[PDB]
Amino acid sequence: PPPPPAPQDVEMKEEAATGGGSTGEADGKTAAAAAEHSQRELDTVTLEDIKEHVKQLEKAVSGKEPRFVLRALRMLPSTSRRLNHYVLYKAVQGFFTSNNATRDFLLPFLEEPMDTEADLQFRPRTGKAASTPLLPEVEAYLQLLVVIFMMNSKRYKEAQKISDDLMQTQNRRALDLVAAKCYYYHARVYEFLDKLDVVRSFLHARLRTATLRHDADGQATLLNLLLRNYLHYSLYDQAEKLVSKSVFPEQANNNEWARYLYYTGRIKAIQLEYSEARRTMTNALRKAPQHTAVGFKQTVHKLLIVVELLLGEIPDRLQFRQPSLKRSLMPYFLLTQAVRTGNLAKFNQVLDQFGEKFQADGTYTLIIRLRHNVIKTGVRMISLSYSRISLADIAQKLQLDSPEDAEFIVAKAIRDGVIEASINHEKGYVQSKEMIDIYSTREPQLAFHQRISFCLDIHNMSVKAMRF
Amino acid sequence: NYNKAVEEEDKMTPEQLAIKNVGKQDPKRHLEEHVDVLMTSNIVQCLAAMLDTVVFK
Amino acid sequence: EQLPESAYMHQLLGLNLLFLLSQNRVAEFHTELERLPAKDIQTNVYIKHPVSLEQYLMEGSYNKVFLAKGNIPAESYTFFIDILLDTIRDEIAGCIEKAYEKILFTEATRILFFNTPKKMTDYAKKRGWVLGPNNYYSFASQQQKPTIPSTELAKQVIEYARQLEMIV
Amino acid sequence: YLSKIEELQLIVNDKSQNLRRLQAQRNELNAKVRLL
Amino acid sequence: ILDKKFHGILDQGEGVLIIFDEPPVDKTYEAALETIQNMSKVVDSLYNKAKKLT
Amino acid sequence: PKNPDLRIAQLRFLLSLPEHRGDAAVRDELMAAVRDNNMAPYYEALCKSLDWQIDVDLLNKMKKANEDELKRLDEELEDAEKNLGESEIRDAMMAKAEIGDKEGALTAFRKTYDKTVALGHRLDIVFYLLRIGLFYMDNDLITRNTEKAKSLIEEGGDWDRRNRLKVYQGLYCVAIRDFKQAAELFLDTVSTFTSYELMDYKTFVTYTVYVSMIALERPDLREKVIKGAEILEVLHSLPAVRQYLFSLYECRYSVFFQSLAVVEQEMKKDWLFAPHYRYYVREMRIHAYSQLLESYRSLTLGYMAEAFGVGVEFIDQELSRFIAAGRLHCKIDKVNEIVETNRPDSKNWQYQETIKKGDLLLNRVQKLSRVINM
Amino acid sequence: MSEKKQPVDEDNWDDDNVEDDFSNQLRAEKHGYKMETS
């Protein structure tokens, strides 16, 4: 009863801003987005995700959600007296007896701000009234009398889709900002039990309705939902992105775009790619927003640089290593050691030692080409090393035992185009060369057009950012 | 030749723009008066590069 | 999905996979490696033999073709391994002198097969080829001999200075 | 709805008019420095 | 040669020594090093930026 | 008085690195325990070396001596602070508590850092924290104390003691793979003649050369080793590595490899190097090969295989994995056995760093200047 | 932030990356025994 005043304070600090302030920031505002309380409220949703939200236990049971959802009314200027009601109900938790009125009694509590009066006209108060109670209910998924209620609370959020689609006005720059979060929690609670089936068409038509009339933070986030949907399950509709690539917003949330490029980097990694996939993995890597969230870059980075492992030109990756990730990369450290080593028995004994964590990865694409990566590491090293090597030297240095499969190796390496190396054809016996004096002057200034044209692009972008 | 010798003093102004907490009066707004000159310089460089292939044949 | 277990399940995937391997795809191979991965390494020789066979094909052996053809009818993969012989031979048409010096009759006999039909003669009279004296060359220079890098980048300087104009 | 959405968004594009307000500030600064 | 007393290449595969040295490039050295210092200065300014931001 | 305790640190390293005759560690630990009351050697040998074959009571008696010693130290703690002492009560207790178990340490540093008053109060405190660190292969103690020192000790200090702090910094710089600032801080040679910190000025020379044959480029090589004949009047006592350095100018690769094996074993059997000495030797290898090839191009490894000993296959795998280690741009074959002089920075790299950084930092500030708005 | 699925989850340390790069070359006599091999 002395700690629940801290949810009592932060609860009023949240819906003061949200209800009164963003309702006044919805009345006449939003020239581009003057709803700064929307980003303030998403900051407070991250604040309720740091802390306990409001009333999970808090030394009592079920105090705020029966309390504050009453009597908003939006009327004559003595509705700060309804705020005074909200404030002076707080003798119940400290003084009186707390009673259980959440997760069961919420079904008319959500209908209370509609059945008081014709409160107001805008939907962000309705999204408030169905989000700010019900998002404090989702992160307790103990699957007993709590997850069927997340299910029904997000059925009320599907009614919030209905009252997002037929609400009379660019309130989507608040409701899609909240709906990004809560539709991720939709996908979470729906897939804590089974794969979601008609929620796919929910998501399809929800992407459809956000097409042009209000195309603001909805398309990219629902596309992240759709992408991770097609990622977690069988892989049939990546041709949909190959035919309907409409994936380019303002890239607003500045981390949504980062992890979006990460997810589609995993896509192009699993389709087939080295180059474009590793460069968008690199751009998402350097577009890591901060390290203010403990060890969340780490597992996702273990799966990020799988393609760089598949390059073969990677050293040990240890600068990323969280020490709490060490006990999980007990396979992965020896795996990049098996990348640095050319042993074959160790190449399959790391697999024979860690196939279960390789299934935890669940990417066969790595081991279906990692032997080929070992022989390409060999050919890159030794073909960069010597001018006129023999195929027998490298062959029976890497246990090939015959000339003709070394010929097929050198031939498919010419076909893969690393070095000039040809064969002094009598019985093999490579006659070859390196390549210095290739070119060095007009060829840099070919790329310097892209250098400085990229620089002047960022000049004009800083100009259009200086405009703000 | 003088460009590599001139920019390296105005380049000391960001070292003087190290005015972190509260230390900045007028920013010594002299970072310019070299760029425009650099512009003209390489502008004419590209001009003449053109005029070579243009006039010469 | 809860169906009775399909009889030809193991080799319908193999028909599709060997047809894919014949028509030279690049990513449907990997969506095949993703739709049913768990039955590939433990069992299913109709799939376990083509996927390690692909590892051997892009490992560097067109002779594992014949080592394998020791036993792959596999209910009429015979047409598809004939198309696999075709993708041996036209990839020889590419990869016979990509950047080689020269081959002779015997390297034709090793990399190619069927010692001399009118089909390697058709190669020598179909790709623009010089059948040298028991000898081979791609051409007399093999590269078609690969002198002005200035004026095109001068036009680049035109639009480059132009884009540096109109902006500050 | 049918033919009533685009010019509202065009007045929304008067953020470009706000860009003109910014360039107005600019030319104010410049004109008065030149007055100096 | 190791101490700049001599500048050039000798030979035993051909037994023919050749002398050469043309170091000075004020453009590259000067401008590049000045730009390096500029990078350091921008690194400095990064913290003024991150501060005035938050 | 850390020189004998530096020898005790070497005793701990002998206990640590060579597990050949664990009784030898027990030997010198019992020898250091039978006098000087040094019981910490005896627990240290009990743990890692033999479990004290016969020292159950033969050193428990001197442990009780150390117990009475510590108890009378902590009693004079109050007997002397009964009188007025300008932090000198706590100074005496920290000095005498810097012998037995970590009890002495916890009654040493918990009673000085609180009332460390003047330069000496921390001068000796940081010297002896360097010693308590160096007893093991520590770096937290021997440089965290230098941090406190920066806050506490010098403030102008002496023309004598401050050079000693700097030589501590250089001594760890050679202890760690900081292959330059050691010799930089060991460039004094006029202020480290003999001290209770200098376990041996000849060992000073050892630590110095084991960082100067790398820090000192050929000009700095001759500057400090040749020109700086001040260390020569003393390094006259260790001519092996000296003559190695002499060849290190004329580039005599045969004796390079002889002394290379020699110094390899030496570092293999020398303190604060056990888990790291791997690179130094192959680094000497690649660095010498750099200049050797830099001689000219139309040359062979076989012509140098003589200097390599029989080094055709040796350097075959060696330089294969070295260029594989991304080292020493050059050209060499087996069927041709090439040598090369190449890699001019002012060819493209002196122009490639340009974008290497003006794109790294460009996009750094870009994304940095992206979240300023989004 | 880490709002993704991922919430599911110098002594020698400086020289250690090179050490694992040194983990493939004669870790630390056959060098010196090669002298008498010829």
> In the beta sheet, which residues pair with residue F90?
none
Are F279 and G31 an interchain contact pair (Cβ–Cβ within 8 Å)? no
In angstroms, the separation between the Cα of residue G20 and the nearest Cα of chain A is 8
Query: Which of F338, F348, F371 lies closest to A444 in CB terms?
Result: F348
- CA-nearest of A329, A355, A350 to C38 is A355
Residue with tokens 């959440």, as numbered in its chain: A102
Contacts with G38 (C-beta within 8 Å, 6 or more apart), sequence order: F310
In angstroms, the separation between the Cα of residue A123 and the nearest Cα of chain D is 18
CB-CB contact of C43 with C36 (8 Å): no
Find the closest chain A residue to C48 by CA distance. A368
Please name the helix (run of DSSP H) or strand (run of DSSP E) that holds residue A91, with its range, or none.
helix A91-94
Pairing of strands C130-132, C135-137: antiparallel
Distance from C-alpha of G37 to C-alpha of A73, rounded to nearest angstrom: 98
| Number of neighbouring beta carbons within 10 Å of residue F148 | 16
Contacts with A120 (C-beta within 8 Å, 6 or more apart), sequence order: A23, A72, A74
Distance from C-alpha of C103 to C-alpha of C101, rounded to nearest angstrom: 7
Are C151 and B53 an interchain contact pair (Cβ–Cβ within 8 Å)? yes
Distance from C-alpha of A56 to C-alpha of A65, rounded to nearest angstrom: 11
Residue with tokens 């020109």, as numbered in its chain: F227
**Is there contact between D and A if contact means ≥3 C-beta pairs under 8 Å?**
yes
Please name the helix (run of DSSP H) or strand (run of DSSP E) that holds residue A7, with its range, or none.
helix A5-15
Residue with tokens 């006129």, as numbered in its chain: A388
Distance from C-alpha of F170 to C-alpha of F204, rounded to nearest angstrom: 11
The 10 Å CB-count burial string (b at 16+, else e) for F259-297 is: bbbebbebbeebbbbbebbbbbbbbbbbbbbeebbbbbb
Distance from C-alpha of F221 to C-alpha of F239, rounded to nearest angstrom: 16
CB-CB contact of F8 with F29 (8 Å): no
**CB contact, 8 Å: A297 with chain G?**
yes
- CA-nearest of A220, A135, A116, A127 to A174 is A127
User: In whole angstroms, how far apart are CA F42 and each of C89, F25, F30, F32, F54?
Assistant: 79, 10, 6, 8, 11
Distance from C-alpha of F276 to C-alpha of G18, rounded to nearest angstrom: 9
Please name the helix (run of DSSP H) or strand (run of DSSP E) that holds residue E19, with its range, or none.
strand E18-19
- CA-nearest of A337, A308, A302 to A320 is A302
Distance from C-alpha of B52 to C-alpha of B42, rounded to nearest angstrom: 15
Q: Is E9 helix (H, G, I), strand (E, B) or coil?
A: strand
- CA-nearest of C127, C124, C126 to C135 is C124
- CA-nearest of A446, E25, C99 to F350 is E25
Distance from C-alpha of A80 to C-alpha of A20, rounded to nearest angstrom: 10
Q: For residue F253, with 0-12 CB atoms within 10 Å meaning exposed, 13-18 middle and 19 or more buried, which class applies?
A: buried
> In the beta sheet, which residues pair with residue E8?
E19
> In the beta sheet, which residues pair with residue A422?
A431
Distance from C-alpha of F333 to C-alpha of C91, rounded to nearest angstrom: 32
Distance from C-alpha of F181 to C-alpha of F158, rounded to nearest angstrom: 21
- CA-nearest of F307, F302, F303 to F334 is F302
**CB contact, 8 Å: A395 with chain C?**
no
- CA-nearest of A292, A222, A216, A287 to A258 is A287
Q: Which chains touch B (3 or more CB pairs under 8 A)?
A: C, E
Helices (H), A272-364: 275-286, 296-302, 306-309, 326-329, 332-340, 344-361
Distance from C-alpha of A311 to C-alpha of A306, rounded to nearest angstrom: 9
In angstroms, the separation between the Cα of residue A392 and the nearest Cα of chain C is 15
Distance from C-alpha of F190 to C-alpha of F181, rounded to nearest angstrom: 17
Query: Which of G1, G5, G17 lies closest to A293 in CB terms?
Result: G1
> G19: which 2 tokens?
């050490």
User: In whole angstroms, how far apart are CA C73 and each of C51, C76, F33?
Assistant: 16, 6, 83
> A438: which 2 tokens?
């290739």
Dmax (CA) for chain C in angstroms is 72
Residue A131 DSSP one-character state: H
Are F373 and A468 an interchain contact pair (Cβ–Cβ within 8 Å)? yes
> In the beta sheet, which residues pair with residue E10?
F296
Displacement of CA C55 from its chain's centroid (Å): 13
Residue with tokens 């000192």, as numbered in its chain: F216
The phi and psi torsions of A422 (rounded to 5 degrees) equal: -105, -175
Distance from C-alpha of F93 to C-alpha of F81, rounded to nearest angstrom: 11
Find the closest chain A residue to D22 by CA distance. A467
- CA-nearest of A24, A1, A5 to A13 is A5
Transcribe chain C into DSSP letters: ---PPPTTHHHHHHHHHHHHHHHT-SSHHHHHHHHS-TTSSSS-HHHHHHHHHHHHHTTT-SSHHHHHHTT--TTT-HHHHHHHHHHHHHHHHHTTSSS-S---HHHHHHHS-SSS-HHHHHHHTTTT-EEETTEEESSSSSS------SHHHHHHHHHHHHHHSS--
Residue with tokens 């921390």, as numbered in its chain: F122
The phi and psi torsions of A276 (rounded to 5 degrees) equal: -65, -35
Are F338 and A387 an interchain contact pair (Cβ–Cβ within 8 Å)? yes
Instruction: Write the Ramachandran bin of F128: left for phi over 0, alpha for psi from -120 to 50, otherwise beta.
Output: alpha
Distance from C-alpha of F23 to C-alpha of F51, rounded to nearest angstrom: 10
Are A255 and G1 an interchain contact pair (Cβ–Cβ within 8 Å)? yes
Please name the helix (run of DSSP H) or strand (run of DSSP E) that holds residue E8, with its range, or none.
strand E8-9
**CB contact, 8 Å: F363 with chain A?**
yes
- CA-nearest of A218, A30, A56, A31 to A140 is A56
Chain D neighbors of A172, CB-CB under 8 A: none
Residue with tokens 């391997």, as numbered in its chain: C21
Q: For residue C118, with 0-12 CB atoms within 10 Å meaning exposed, 13-18 middle and 19 or more buried, which class applies?
A: exposed
Distance from C-alpha of C5 to C-alpha of C81, rounded to nearest angstrom: 28
Q: How big is the CA angle at D14 (ends D10 and D19), to the nearest 5 degrees?
A: 145
Return the sign of the alpha-carbon dihedral for residues A96, A99, A103, A107.
negative
Instruction: Write the Ramachandran bin of A386: left for phi over 0, alpha for psi from -120 to 50, otherwise beta.
Output: beta
Q: Is A125 helix (H, G, I), strand (E, B) or coil?
A: helix
Chain C neighbors of A463, CB-CB under 8 A: 167-168
CB-CB contact of F70 with F98 (8 Å): no
Give chain B's count of helices (H) and strands (E): 3, 0
> A251: which 2 tokens?
């890239």
**CB contact, 8 Å: B18 with chain E?**
yes
Method of elucidation: cryo-EM
> In the beta sheet, which residues pair with residue A431?
A422
Distance from C-alpha of A344 to C-alpha of A374, rounded to nearest angstrom: 9
The phi and psi torsions of A280 (rounded to 5 degrees) equal: -80, -25
Put simply, the chain G residues between 9 and 38 with a CB less than 8 A from any chain A CB are 9, 16-17, 20-21, 23-24
User: In whole angstroms, how far apart are CA E5 and each of A22, E2, E19, E21, F187?
Assistant: 78, 7, 12, 11, 27
Distance from C-alpha of B29 to C-alpha of A400, rounded to nearest angstrom: 68
Q: Which amino acid is at A34?
A: A
Q: Is E18 helix (H, G, I), strand (E, B) or coil?
A: strand
Q: For residue E44, with 0-12 CB atoms within 10 Å meaning exposed, 13-18 middle and 19 or more buried, which class applies?
A: middle
Q: Which amino acid is at B44?
A: V
Distance from C-alpha of F134 to C-alpha of F166, rounded to nearest angstrom: 16
> D16: which 2 tokens?
């470009």
HEC states along chain F?
Answer: CHHHHHHHHHHHHHHHCCCCCHHHHHHHHHHHHCCCCCCHHHHHHHHCCCCCCCCCCCCHHHHHHHHHHHHHHHHHHHHHHCCCCCCHHHHHHHHHHCCCCHHHHHCCHHHCCCCCCCHHHHHHHHHHHHHHHHCCCCCHHHHHHHHHHHHHCCCCCCCCHHHHHHHHHHHHHHHCCCCCHHHHHCCCCCCCCCCCCCCCHHHHHHHHHHHHHHHCCHHHHHHHHHHCHHHHHHHCCCHHHHHHHHHHHHCCHHHHHHHHHHHHHHHHCCCCCCCCCHHHHHHHHHHHHHHHHHCECCCCHHHHHCCCCCCCHHHHHHHHHHHHCCCCCCCCCCCCCCCCCCCCCCCCHHHHHHHHHHCHHHHHHHHHCCCCCC
Residue with tokens 């604040």, as numbered in its chain: A47
Residue with tokens 């028991």, as numbered in its chain: C134
> A236: which 2 tokens?
């049939």
The phi and psi torsions of C137 (rounded to 5 degrees) equal: -150, 150
Helices (H), A110-218: 112-115, 124-131, 147-165, 172-190, 199-209
Transcribe A407-463 into DSSP letters: HHHHHHHHHTTS---EE-TTS--EE-----SS--SHHHHHHHHHHHHHHHHHHHHHH
Length of chain D: 36
Query: Which of A46, A228, A296 lies closest to G7 in CB terms?
Result: A296
Displacement of CA A205 from its chain's centroid (Å): 22
Residue with tokens 């012998």, as numbered in its chain: F99
**CB contact, 8 Å: C153 with chain A?**
yes
Distance from C-alpha of C41 to C-alpha of F38, rounded to nearest angstrom: 64
Size of interface A-C (CB pairs under 8 A): 92
Chain B neighbors of C151, CB-CB under 8 A: 53
Torsion of CA A128, A132, A134, A135, to 10 degrees: 120
For residue C52, the number of C-alpha atoms closer than 13 Å in the C-beta half-sphere is 11
Supply the angle between the helices B3-10 and B35-55 in degrees, to the nearest 10.
150
Contacts with A117 (C-beta within 8 Å, 6 or more apart), sequence order: A73, A75
Whole-angstrom Cα Rg for chain C:
24
> A217: which 2 tokens?
């933070």
Pairing of strands C135-137, E8-9: unpaired
Chain C neighbors of A270, CB-CB under 8 A: 30, 34
**CB contact, 8 Å: B29 with chain E?**
no
Are E34 and B20 an interchain contact pair (Cβ–Cβ within 8 Å)? no
Distance from C-alpha of A376 to C-alpha of A394, rounded to nearest angstrom: 12
Supply the angle between the helices A219-232 and A256-271 in degrees, to the nearest 10.
40
Query: Which of E9, E11, E32 lies closest to F350 in CB terms?
Result: E32
Choosing among A296, A297, A324, A341, which should be mutated to test the G contact, i.e. which has the most G CBs within 10 A?
A296
CB-CB contact of A251 with F374 (8 Å): yes
| Number of neighbouring beta carbons within 10 Å of residue B29 | 8
Q: For residue B23, with 0-12 CB atoms within 10 Å meaning exposed, 13-18 middle and 19 or more buried, which class applies?
A: exposed
Q: Is A122 helix (H, G, I), strand (E, B) or coil?
A: coil
Distance from C-alpha of F248 to C-alpha of F213, rounded to nearest angstrom: 8
Distance from C-alpha of F208 to C-alpha of F230, rounded to nearest angstrom: 13
Q: Which amino acid is at A67?
A: R
In angstroms, the separation between the Cα of residue B14 and the nearest Cα of chain E is 6
Residues followed by a break in chain A (C to N exceeding 2.5 Å) are 168
> F328: which 2 tokens?
């020493």
